[PDB]
Design a protein around this ligand. Structure first.
Ligand SMILES: O=C(NO)c1cn(Cc2ccccc2Cl)cc1-c1ccccc1
Ligand SMILES: [Zn+2]
Length: 266
């Protein structure tokens, strides 16, 4: 099996590995990067993998140690790929945005790297692997066209998010975020912080404020209350999407729908 650290990396790997080997996701969606410690059973899975796919030590810091013993020809470390360097832009404490799965261009380079490793590891399946890469790139191009068109009429509409993640996706499709607020998903900001957030919401003319699935509706409402800003939800992990050949294209389209759902009209 190919073992991917995070679900959207699973989406990409499952496009390339389809009909060749299973794709597995290491961690449940609810986990994170610095508090999370790997179970010995997780380490075993990594070492048993045909191929490990992860962003790298600036993102899944918790697995850097586990991945040292795995040979280079059995891992794709996305942040360290040669073709990914010119695609990086300025796990949140590092210098670069490491939410790399949100860049269609980085997804493409990831798929190429996965394909290349798999062909070396499983040359008996080269043709199927070539076919899978061909199909992934064709879907990505088609999705890219479709999403770009869905999001084009939304240009210029401002919004805030509770997570500085989406820059790769927003720059690529020409969305115009105003900025981000650090908000605890379980606990609303204090009186002073909330005042400052709410005034920026109105002052900067935001159409929407976007939360994520793990935010308690109460804290989102507390942020949006009084302002005339519509509330939205973005899911940067596509938690509801199953692994499979078409999953990464489905993820990019679902994210567009989530943006559009709050942003369009008014
Ligand atoms: O980037 C982030 N935090 O700053 C994330 C945001 N999420 C969204 C999320 C968290 C918990 C449960 C569901 C979801 Cl969609 C997941 C991560 C995340 C997951 C694994 C590793 C690092 C981050
Ligand atoms: Zn993040």
């Amino acid at each position: 099996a190919v073992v991917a650290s995070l679900k959207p990396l699973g989406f990409i790997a499952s496009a390339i590995a389809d009909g060749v080997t299973d794709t597995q996701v290491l961690l449940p969606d609810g986990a994170s990067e610095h508090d999370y410690s790997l179970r010995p059973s997780d380490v075993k899975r990594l070492q048993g993998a045909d191929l490990v796919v992860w962003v790298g030590p600036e993102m899944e810091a918790f697995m850097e140690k586990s991945v040292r013993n795995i040979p280079d020809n059995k891992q794709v470390t996305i942040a360290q790929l040669a073709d990914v360097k010119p695609l990086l832009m300025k796990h949140h404490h590092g210098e670069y945005n490491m939410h790399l799965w949100l860049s269609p261009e980085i997804a493409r380079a990831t798929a190429v790297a996965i394909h290349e490793k798999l062909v070396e590891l499983m040359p008996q399946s080269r043709a199927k692997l070539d076919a899978n890469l061909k199909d992934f790139e064709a879907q990505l191009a088609a999705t890219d066209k479709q999403v770009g068109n869905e999001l084009a009429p939304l240009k210029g509409k401002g919004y805030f998010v509770f997570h500085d993640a989406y820059g790769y996706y927003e720059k690529h499709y020409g969305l115009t975020p105003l900025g981000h607020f650090t908000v605890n998903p379980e606990i609303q900001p204090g009186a002073q912080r909330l005042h400052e957030i709410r005034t920026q919401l109105v002052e900067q003319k935001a159409t929407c404020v976007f939360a994520e699935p793990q935010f308690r509706p109460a804290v989102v409402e507390a942020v949006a209350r009084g302002t005339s800003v519509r509330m939205g939800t973005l899911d940067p992990l596509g938690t509801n999407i199953k692994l499979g050949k078409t999953s990464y294209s489905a993820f990019l389209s679902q994210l567009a729908n989530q943006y559009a759902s709050c942003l369009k009209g008014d």
